[PDB]
Structure 1
Amino acid sequence: RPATARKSSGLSGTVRIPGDKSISHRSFMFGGLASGETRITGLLEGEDVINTGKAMQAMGARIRKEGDTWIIDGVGNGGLLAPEAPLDFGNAATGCRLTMGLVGVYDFDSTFIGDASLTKRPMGRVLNPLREMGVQVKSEDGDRLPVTLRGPKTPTPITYRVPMASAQVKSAVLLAGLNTPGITTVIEPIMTRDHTEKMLQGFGANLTVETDADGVRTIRLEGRGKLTGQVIDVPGDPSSTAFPLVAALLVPGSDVTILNVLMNPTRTGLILTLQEMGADIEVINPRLAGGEDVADLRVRSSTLKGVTVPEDRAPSMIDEYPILAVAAAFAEGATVMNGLEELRVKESDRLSAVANGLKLNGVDCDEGETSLVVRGRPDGKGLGNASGAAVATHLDHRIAMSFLVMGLVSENPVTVDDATMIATSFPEFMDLMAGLGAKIELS
């Protein structure tokens, strides 16, 4: 299902982006665990959230949705009730793993099952630390579902050095720490997404983060402490935010306000990069949501300037390299994006797709084994492709959307060989963008 974006006259509108999955998941989980009531609006009701909510309900949380608001009466930290049946996580690997972390330390049997897909996924990175806290683990093969957990009557807090920087493992251990007396500590070599830390604090947990000279982080959590209900308006998905954000910056005569933007630095490498590139992004109505920094962004057409993007920023914007590279195609000078680390543990996987799409669209860029270099053309002259040449998306929704955004600015249209994958990632993309005045013709 190819799609073509054509030069836009100027984007305008106020849009809200679908809630972030991670914050939605934690809001729902913490909402069910905390004492008191939590009200959530903007929830991304995806598999992880849904399945996690089902599990929280299975363990005593009272959940209901009224209007656009989910209302959760939590069981209180340490208040989880033994589930009467296995907790099926379908294909929600994240919801499954975090729930395991949360529940494994409870002194009741918990069985986790999932579909064929999730059942093949390794769980050991989460199961290992649970075992170290005293959890009895019964699992298949190389620690795969189905998994039965039974926490000890009293778990032991642990000081876990995440063998490998993982926000999820860190998250699983911290959640495990919640029902554990004493201080559970997670030490991660580099700061990874810290939504669990942020949201725990947002729910009243006694959690601190120490960072040493090397940036090594020591997250300490006082277990069995209180967690209390919160009013949470879930911030939007940063990666989805990226598109209208970049489109508004690039399409001249554009003035767009994006509501409820997550401003957590571990998720906003793109925004930070654009700001350095001189993006006219006005941060307004700053506030907190479940402990997360949130603001709305008033984005006006800007003249972006090339910058060098440090490899250490990549984690905070891993999925935004495609759209940043597109933004770079319209920025002054060159933009240098370093980090061959893992664009699939490669520096030519979909990294090549982006480079190729750019080239296909007249963009002067150089793809290396360590850095992608893009020399931009702010006025988009000569960019795009008048012959209708379609960018090979390689079933990558990020490439499809980034290049559709590109066509809103390039002198010549940009076509993507397929947009179907957009429905599976940011289905409201087409409507939101068209709503802003973007002209995207779908095959």
Structure 2
Amino acid sequence: SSRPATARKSSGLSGTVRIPGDKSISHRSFMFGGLASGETRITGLLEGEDVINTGKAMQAMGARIRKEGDTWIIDGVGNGGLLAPEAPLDFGNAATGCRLTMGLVGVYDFDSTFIGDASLTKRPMGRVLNPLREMGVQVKSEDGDRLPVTLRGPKTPTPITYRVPMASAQVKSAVLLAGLNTPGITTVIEPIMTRDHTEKMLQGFGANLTVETDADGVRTIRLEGRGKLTGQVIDVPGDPSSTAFPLVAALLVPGSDVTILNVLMNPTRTGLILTLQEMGADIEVINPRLAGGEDVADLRVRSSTLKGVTVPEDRAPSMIDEYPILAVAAAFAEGATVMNGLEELRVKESDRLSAVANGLKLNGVDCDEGETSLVVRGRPDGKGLGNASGAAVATHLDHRIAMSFLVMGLVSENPVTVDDATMIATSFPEFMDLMAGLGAKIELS
């Protein structure tokens, strides 16, 4: 079952908080630490449900994982050393874990089965299963290439050169991870850059992986297969997608001044910040530095008056998971915010385009949902927004829909209710406590 929650108008958010670790990097830390030779030590790991599921999948294949103090320590099996799992690998709500693991173990000569929850089971897997079929993996999937899926790798996989058709870092990642156990050179060509945690981290683990960018922006990523991977010390930066929630809340709630510490600032993750700055947001980037091999900074966010802007389709990959919270900010901006190139939103935990549009309408917002776009016209004073009758936003098992609308309720004249807050812990278990500490009033049923 589910647990609804209602957000109420706040008098001002204020404080300094450390945001939880980056989910993308956390997933990969468990995966690469579990695969590599020797020991990997991780500090700052996100302990949300999605990451825990990836950890259990790696344990199922032979890695030993334990938490000593505040450090997760992993004893890896070495490249080529994964063991056949006894039972299905349950990824719950996590597409990142599921899709990357399909590439990782699908190329091994044993059977592996992938299952997940009601939301993950409806998402498309063909985007990863097709290149695996080219590599020689035998695939048994449900119609439409959906879970459950059982893979059986060939004795010797075939390396491929794959041009990713949509701006998916998960597809690029799955093909590169498959390349780790494939003899020869695996090449991934990305016409538009997507988050590059896989490339940066594999290089950090010693992989002979190179990235070449043409002047036209196309990336050619080459990986030599069956090479040694060496355990590493990892310091996980703060999640920029989780940061988006208290950050947008601070921009919208009058009388706010919130500082978020140690936030990942890799440009493939900062499209929302750039967009909000263009809308007039007061976001100060403090002490930009290098930590754990990544760019991080502290962000001081203050109440701002926002104006609608046009968000180009090519910025989408750099902020794809932040469209829900951006749409909420647009609900309080002067004028229209226009966002196109949103086809990928329809295949996430929920069809995010439909869920955001329906949630906004339920809460009095004037918006137009297109097949691949969203136009939102705001009401800066928040008058008439929210839902006085207490009607609940349908979250469709999507944690980001739940968090985005709860942020809306801190600003709207009328409270905003979401039908379920139980999935928030998949990526941000600290959400309720963190927001409450800043002054937000959110009542869990």
Q: How far off its partner does 1:436 sit?
A: 0.6
When structure 1 is superposed on structure 2, of 23-32 and 233-242 the one drifting more is 233-242
Q: How many residues align?
A: 443
Residues 65/214 of structure 1: CA separation in 2 closer, same or farther (3 Å cut) = same
1:405-433: per-residue Cα shift (whole Å, max 9, x none)? 22323345444565555466644332221
Q: How far off its partner does 1:262 sit?
A: 2.9
Asked if structure 2 preserves the Cα contact closer than 8 Å seen for 1:400 and 1:416, the reply is yes
Matched, 1:182 2:169: no
Residues 251/207 of structure 1: CA separation in 2 closer, same or farther (3 Å cut) = same
Asked if structure 2 preserves the Cα contact closer than 8 Å seen for 1:174 and 1:221, the reply is yes
When structure 1 is superposed on structure 2, of 115-124 and 38-47 the one drifting more is 115-124
When structure 1 is superposed on structure 2, of 1-10 and 172-181 the one drifting more is 1-10
CA distance in 1, matches of 2:437, 2:290: 28
When structure 1 is superposed on structure 2, of 420-429 and 6-15 the one drifting more is 420-429
Q: Secondary structure at the match of 1:160?
A: strand
1:137-172: per-residue Cα shift (whole Å, max 9, x none)? 677888777777665665443212235543323212
Q: How far off its partner does 1:354 sit?
A: 3.8
Asked if structure 2 preserves the Cα contact closer than 8 Å seen for 1:231 and 1:289, the reply is no
Residues 438/158 of structure 1: CA separation in 2 closer, same or farther (3 Å cut) = same
CA distance in 2, matches of 1:115, 1:350: 17
1:271-313: per-residue Cα shift (whole Å, max 9, x none)? 2211222322223344556654333322222232322111233
Percent identity among equivalent residues?
Answer: 100
Residues 57/304 of structure 1: CA separation in 2 closer, same or farther (3 Å cut) = same
When structure 1 is superposed on structure 2, of 360-369 and 238-247 the one drifting more is 360-369
1:170-207: per-residue Cα shift (whole Å, max 9, x none)? 21210121233432101233333332223212323332
Asked if structure 2 preserves the Cα contact closer than 8 Å seen for 1:366 and 1:374, the reply is yes
Q: Tell me the residue number matched to 1:202.
A: 204
Asked if structure 2 preserves the Cα contact closer than 8 Å seen for 1:194 and 1:266, the reply is yes
CA distance in 1, matches of 2:418, 2:61: 46
When structure 1 is superposed on structure 2, of 141-150 and 323-332 the one drifting more is 141-150
Q: Secondary structure at the match of 1:200?
A: helix
1:343-371: per-residue Cα shift (whole Å, max 9, x none)? 42799976465445545555455555664
Residues 318/124 of structure 1: CA separation in 2 closer, same or farther (3 Å cut) = closer
Q: Tell me the residue number matched to 2:227.
A: 225
1:248-286: per-residue Cα shift (whole Å, max 9, x none)? 112233221223423233333222211222322223344
Q: How far off its partner does 1:66 sit?
A: 0.4
Q: How far off its partner does 1:64 sit?
A: 1.8
Q: Secondary structure at the match of 2:375?
A: strand
TM-score, with length taken from structure 2: 0.81
When structure 1 is superposed on structure 2, of 109-118 and 32-41 the one drifting more is 109-118
Asked if structure 1 preserves the Cα contact closer than 8 Å seen for 2:193 and 2:317, the reply is no
Matched, 1:355 2:343: no
Instruction: Give ranges in structure 1 of 5+ residues lacking alignment.
Output: none
Residues 201/346 of structure 1: CA separation in 2 closer, same or farther (3 Å cut) = closer
Asked if structure 1 preserves the Cα contact closer than 8 Å seen for 2:350 and 2:397, the reply is no
Residues 180/356 of structure 1: CA separation in 2 closer, same or farther (3 Å cut) = closer
Q: Tell me the residue number matched to 2:122.
A: 120
Residues 150/384 of structure 1: CA separation in 2 closer, same or farther (3 Å cut) = closer
When structure 1 is superposed on structure 2, of 45-54 and 112-121 the one drifting more is 112-121
Asked if structure 1 preserves the Cα contact closer than 8 Å seen for 2:402 and 2:420, the reply is yes
TM-score, with length taken from structure 1: 0.81
Asked if structure 2 preserves the Cα contact closer than 8 Å seen for 1:383 and 1:410, the reply is yes
Asked if structure 1 preserves the Cα contact closer than 8 Å seen for 2:124 and 2:347, the reply is no
When structure 1 is superposed on structure 2, of 242-251 and 321-330 the one drifting more is 321-330
Residues 141/253 of structure 1: CA separation in 2 closer, same or farther (3 Å cut) = closer
Asked if structure 2 preserves the Cα contact closer than 8 Å seen for 1:171 and 1:196, the reply is yes
CA distance in 2, matches of 1:346, 1:51: 18
Asked if structure 1 preserves the Cα contact closer than 8 Å seen for 2:107 and 2:181, the reply is yes
Asked if structure 2 preserves the Cα contact closer than 8 Å seen for 1:347 and 1:370, the reply is no
Asked if structure 2 preserves the Cα contact closer than 8 Å seen for 1:203 and 1:290, the reply is no
Q: How far off its partner does 1:21 sit?
A: 3.2
Asked if structure 2 preserves the Cα contact closer than 8 Å seen for 1:198 and 1:290, the reply is no
Asked if structure 2 preserves the Cα contact closer than 8 Å seen for 1:41 and 1:232, the reply is yes
CA distance in 1, matches of 2:117, 2:386: 42
Q: Secondary structure at the match of 1:131?
A: helix
1:38-74: per-residue Cα shift (whole Å, max 9, x none)? 2113333456544443443454433221012111132
Residues 275/36 of structure 1: CA separation in 2 closer, same or farther (3 Å cut) = farther
CA distance in 1, matches of 2:440, 2:79: 47
Residues 320/146 of structure 1: CA separation in 2 closer, same or farther (3 Å cut) = closer
Residues 72/162 of structure 1: CA separation in 2 closer, same or farther (3 Å cut) = same
1:370-407: per-residue Cα shift (whole Å, max 9, x none)? 64333434444565466666656566544443333223
Asked if structure 1 preserves the Cα contact closer than 8 Å seen for 2:119 and 2:349, the reply is no
Asked if structure 2 preserves the Cα contact closer than 8 Å seen for 1:341 and 1:347, the reply is no
Q: Which is greater in Rg?
A: 1
Residues 177/297 of structure 1: CA separation in 2 closer, same or farther (3 Å cut) = same
Residues 397/104 of structure 1: CA separation in 2 closer, same or farther (3 Å cut) = closer
Residues 232/124 of structure 1: CA separation in 2 closer, same or farther (3 Å cut) = same
Asked if structure 1 preserves the Cα contact closer than 8 Å seen for 2:395 and 2:418, the reply is yes
Q: How far off its partner does 1:245 sit?
A: 1.0
Asked if structure 2 preserves the Cα contact closer than 8 Å seen for 1:137 and 1:150, the reply is yes
Q: How far off its partner does 1:244 sit?
A: 0.7
Q: Tell me the residue number matched to 1:55.
A: 57
Asked if structure 2 preserves the Cα contact closer than 8 Å seen for 1:2 and 1:442, the reply is yes
When structure 1 is superposed on structure 2, of 207-216 and 18-27 the one drifting more is 207-216
CA distance in 2, matches of 1:195, 1:53: 18
Q: Tell me the residue number matched to 1:34.
A: 36
Residues 295/232 of structure 1: CA separation in 2 closer, same or farther (3 Å cut) = farther
Asked if structure 1 preserves the Cα contact closer than 8 Å seen for 2:316 and 2:342, the reply is no
1:299-339: per-residue Cα shift (whole Å, max 9, x none)? 22223232211123334333432321221233344322223
CA distance in 1, matches of 2:179, 2:315: 29
Residues 289/172 of structure 1: CA separation in 2 closer, same or farther (3 Å cut) = farther
Asked if structure 2 preserves the Cα contact closer than 8 Å seen for 1:195 and 1:292, the reply is no
Q: Tell me the residue number matched to 2:270.
A: 268
Residues 80/367 of structure 1: CA separation in 2 closer, same or farther (3 Å cut) = closer
When structure 1 is superposed on structure 2, of 124-133 and 295-304 the one drifting more is 124-133
Q: Secondary structure at the match of 2:77?
A: coil
